[PDB]
Amino acid sequence: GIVEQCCTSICSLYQLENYCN
Amino acid sequence: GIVEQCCTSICSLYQLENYCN
Amino acid sequence: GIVEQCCTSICSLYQLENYCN
Amino acid sequence: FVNQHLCGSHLVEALYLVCGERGFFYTPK
Amino acid sequence: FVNQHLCGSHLVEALYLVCGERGFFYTPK
Amino acid sequence: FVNQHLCGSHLVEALYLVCGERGFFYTPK
Ligand SMILES: [Zn+2]
């Protein structure tokens, strides 16, 4: 999930866009 | 104080309301 | 730089003003 | 409500929201 | 774009900005 | 003034407030 990908790890702008609707 | 209860520990909504005026 | 002075260390108001234009 | 550590400016935002018209006091050590 | 850990309210701000009119979903564990 | 570590978006908010009409530069490593 987003916490694991972007908070405890680092997310690219593209990875973050995977959580847009 | 609030730092000890809510920052270094975790505070419930109710505990946080103890710091309203 | 500002990260080293103010983030990983602590900066006074005066030290922070060194980064105003 | 979130059950997380709330510190510094986040803690003050949380009180601002929770306390509403009452307002609040932020008295750190 | 920033390549940093983004957590809690910062993570939600980042999605808000990045996703724009699409909006987003914030589903923590 | 606060004497605390100020990082990332908090550091930029602090400069925004402190520097006022002057503006500021945020140049991380
Ligand atoms: Zn923060």
UniProtKB/Swiss-Prot annotation, chains A, B, C:
Disulfide-bonded cysteines: 6-11
Protein known as: Insulin A chain
Organism the protein comes from: Homo sapiens (Human)
